[PDB]
Design a binder for this molecule. Structure first.
Ligand SMILES: *[C@@H]1O[C@H](CO[C@@H]2O[C@@H](C)[C@@H](O)[C@@H](O)[C@@H]2O)[C@@H](O[C@@H]2O[C@H](CO)[C@@H](O[C@@H]3O[C@H](CO[C@H]4O[C@H](CO)[C@@H](O)[C@H](O)[C@@H]4O[C@@H]4O[C@H](CO)[C@@H](O)[C@H](O)[C@H]4NC(C)=O)[C@@H](O)[C@H](O[C@H]4O[C@H](CO)[C@@H](O)[C@H](O)[C@@H]4O[C@@H]4O[C@H](CO)[C@@H](O)[C@H](O)[C@H]4NC(C)=O)[C@@H]3O)[C@H](O)[C@H]2NC(C)=O)[C@H](O)[C@H]1NC(C)=O
Lengths: 208, 208
């Protein structure tokens, strides 16, 4: 028995005109007893034909994996068009279909509050910079830390949590040496989201 | 063929003498034809017999569901013992075993810092109080907010996120009326983890 998993593009990919957002249809456990598969693709039902079926990853525990990949228009995903993936096989007397779309609902723009380190943390050598990103919908989003135009590396980001009103929040924690913070370096939480003007915003953080 | 599931106790259960931790073994998709199942329980390979086995329950999908519950000792779970669940049937060629234990790995004491709201958030009629809880292992943990010994409610907490240095961090966000914050009310983030003294700590957050 074989299985399908339909996969949404990256946030950053659909929000940046430079990039190529992609729907990743995934079939796992295609045995050697019937290794040939097929893919049909649909956009509001309309059959499309710009779909690269990239072969054919092998696997450790004696399984396989055949993945199709459809490129998509940024404003066709953002408008919310449903992307259907008709999979076909001889090991399946009926086609398995799997459909996805962007989270329906009114897009709510993020509020972004950066947060200084705790007085209690200045004891240590490194120090935490906190980024509150709250009130957004859908949950698709991108955060990055930077300083003086370059990225920061030691940052980590929580997944987005369903908040009480029905929007989302998440936090980001950039870790930097107490020395860079006290020296007066300025840092930025950078947020990419669909309901932001120009799909992005940036908040500053600096010990004045 | 039937499936077996093995669920650990809640974190709070294994940190509080006041609570009773337990391991629960659920078995779904038990046939109507070959319906009798049998639990044998092992703790570090030693059979135990204090396991309680609730009566079979016919599901609205024509399959049966039996549950076995084993009461474990607090230190036993904390000392990282393996609990094995051996489920038996004739419909099975061999029994099904499932085994579970605490996250092996040297435990780490959570650092807990509370951060006030951004100044930019005082325009809203509610405000956001933040609890950073970082550098804890294992990732089993519990985070309550409260004020004047009474619970709070309107809070949401992130999942624990794997930080760069192998430990975990999370954020808990308590949302209060701006008036309550500004009036000088003091709030508390209480935290439960195995690596804390008395398995507990609280941090205060007030305006002054
Ligand atoms: C016939 O019916 C029964 C029951 O259906 C119910 O009753 C009938 C009458 C109808 O009314 C239905 O509407 C109603 O739903 C069906 O039984 C189901 O069978 C499936 C598997 O086929 C089980 O899936 C597993 O679910 C667990 C989580 O289950 C807990 O949370 C559920 C909500 O998500 C909740 O509904 C469950 O009751 C259960 O509740 C927990 O209870 C314990 C003890 O009682 C308690 O300690 C907890 O507090 C409580 N938890 C919660 C959240 O309330 C899920 O975790 C499993 O996922 C693992 O396995 C998946 C694939 O099997 C995998 O994809 C997942 O990622 C995950 O994989 C694991 O991942 C972990 C960590 O990520 C890792 O450590 C493991 O290695 C890895 N394990 C493996 C092997 O994968 C899993 O999805 C349902 O629980 C079960 N429902 C019930 C109520 O029993 C039955 O299928 C029906 N038959 C048919 C064919 O129709």
């Amino acid at each position: 028995g074989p299985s399908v998993f339909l996969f949404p593009p990256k946030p950053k990919d659909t929000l940046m005109i430079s990039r190529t957002p992609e729907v990743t249809c995934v079939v796992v456990d295609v045995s050697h007893e019937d290794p040939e598969v097929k893919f049909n693709w649909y956009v509001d039902g309309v059959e499309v034909h710009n779909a690269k079926t990239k072969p054919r990853e092998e696997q450790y525990n004696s399984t396989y994996r055949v993945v199709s990949v459809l490129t998509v228009l940024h404003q066709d995903w953002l408008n919310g068009k449903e992307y259907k993936c008709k999979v076909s096989n001889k090991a399946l007397p009926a086609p398995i279909e799997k459909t996805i779309s962007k989270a329906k609902g009114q897009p709510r723009e993020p509020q972004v509050y950066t947060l200084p380190p705790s007085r209690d943390e200045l004891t240590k050598n490194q120090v935490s910079l906190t980024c509150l990103v709250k009130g957004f919908y859908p949950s698709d989003i991108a955060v990055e830390w930077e300083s003086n135009g370059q990225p920061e590396n030691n940052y980590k980001t929580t997944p987005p949590v369903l908040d009480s009103d029905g929007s989302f929040f998440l936090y980001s924690k950039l870790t930097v040496d107490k020395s860079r913070w006290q020296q007066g370096n300025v840092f930025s939480c950078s947020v990419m989201h669909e309901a932001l003007h120009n799909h992005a915003t940036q908040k500053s953080l600096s010990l004045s």
